[PDB]
DNA sequence: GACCACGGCGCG
DNA sequence: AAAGCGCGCCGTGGTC
């Protein structure tokens with residue numbers, strides 16, 4: 001019911017837009033509208049009308065900004081009601097839900113989206129009047145970060161497509177050998193990808209023991225953890241786990257990624273979703289480039305396909321022991337602080353215990369394993385689970401958990417203060433005041449309450465680490481531009497950059513310093529930096 | 541074609 | 553699977 005006005009809109013109007021599909025790098029811009037001052041302006045031809053905007057201001061601003069960047073236009077994102085709602089409550093993840101919560105409807109019409117953006121901005125900006133810590137997060141982190149993310153998304157990353165095509169052919173041959181061996185040991189063929197058929201074979205036909213059951217339907221589970229258990233109670237299991245590895249990698253990375261190269265960039269473009277997680281982390285999708293393989297030799301082969309443009313180098317920067325350092329700061333544990341002031345490495349230390357070798361003997365595959373144990377235990381893994389992953393007696397696992405925490409005695413104190421203030425206020429918060437609402441801290445079913453507790457005390461540590469990385473991205477991005485380097489990926493506590501070969505060294509030193517200095521804590525932040533033609537060689 | 545739930549699993 | 557947390561994507565199996 002807004003007065004139809006002629007295009008263009010006045011400066012500072014709210015934009016609405018419709019995409020043929022959710023990925024801005026692939027979408028056709030179907031319709032473009034703007035709203036301000038009781039007027040809605042609808043664009044005659046959406047692509048041309050992009051040239052008239054000075055900024056993208058409205059719901060999903062970053063997506064329109066990426067599509068503008070793809071078309072050679074600098075149209076930075078500004079205000080986005082989604083960002084306001086997400087700071088108020090990170091359960092606010094989609095326009096559909098935000099619109100109904102704060103007074104409107106997310107439709108499929110640009111003009112209605114424009115009007116909705118204007119109202120939703122007014123209401124939410126008012127709900128934020130007075131929330132000085134959240135306002136600071138919005139102005140100094142989330143709103144400027146969206147500009148960085150738009151540039152990352154539009155830049156993309158070079159992928160060695162030919163290499164991966166070749167790899168698909170080798171991997172397929174190994175899958176068919178493993179499959180043939182599985183069928184032989186079972187005495188007939190069947191779909192190894194059907195967990196239902198595999199369950200029957202393993203537990204009915206071959207009589208193997210069934211260790212555990214699935215959550216929703218109570219089937220006998222065929223998970224890696226259950227199969228690792230009985231990995232000698234039959235050799236078929238050995239093969240199935242290998243088949244699972246290869247097919248996971250082929251179907252998720254090797255085959256799909258080469259078909260996602262963009263015609264106009266020649267590169268691979270992810271999306272960095274800014275209002276997607278309960279803790280303040282980013283997520284990555286279409287495709288997810290935050291879960292590229294790294295653990296196994298085949299995974300590393302896949303990771304080697306992510307390469308630098310000709311004449312450039314990749315620079316990979318990864319915070320050291322990051323959530324332990326954050327925990328040191330948040331809890332104030334004297335022993336934990338000392339650890340890092342002394343340059344100790346808890347992942348290496350735990351790996352030493354796990355595999356029984358001196359710390360100078362811990363290799364990379366060993367240290368990485370220690371990480372799940374270290375964060376497993378910190379965030380509340382059960383002795384039974386630990387016992388089974390480490391392959392030690394139950395009593396040895398309880399003992400490790402007890403020693404872990406008694407090493408750093410103020411941590412349990414910090415957990416209980418976090419939970420207690422979380423029961424009273426209904427949310428928990430990061431160092432910078434980012435909040436997560438956690439009801440159920442007072443639930444009357446113990447299992448439900450204890451799950452809420454593990455959610456609640458993880459969020460301040462994981463979310464503070466997320467705040468620190470976002471703030472560093474915001475500080476680092478202008479310096480990279482001035483140096484002619486590019487930011488490509490964020491993987492929670494890691495940045496991957498692309499830099500001209502002749503500046504790569506200065507870029508690495510500079511990026512390390514900004515990341516280490518982003519916000520001084522009671523413990524040094526240390527960053528490991530590597531340079532290489534490919535993502536794997538850049539982390540060594 | 542489009543959904544979706546589930547078990548499962550890659551990374552942080 | 554189990555008292556780690558946070559994600560997104562796969563294939564299967566099922567429905568419309």
Ligand SMILES: Nc1ccn([C@H]2C[C@H](O)[C@@H](COP(=O)(O)OP(=O)(O)OP(=O)(O)O)O2)c(=O)n1
Pocket residue numbers: 318319320321322323324347371372375376492493552557
């Ligand atoms: N299994 C894991 C792995 C990671 N993380 C969290 C805590 C880590 O600190 C953070 C970053 O992951 P990294 O793999 O980079 O681990 P670290 O930063 O702690 O160790 P490293 O010194 O190897 O970088 O993500 C987690 O909760 N559980």
Ligand SMILES: [Mg+2]
Pocket residue numbers: 318319320321322493
């Ligand atoms: Mg790290």
Ligand SMILES: [Mg+2]
Pocket residue numbers: 318319491493494
């Ligand atoms: Mg990392």
Ligand SMILES: [Mg+2]
Pocket residue numbers: none
């Ligand atoms: Mg699921």
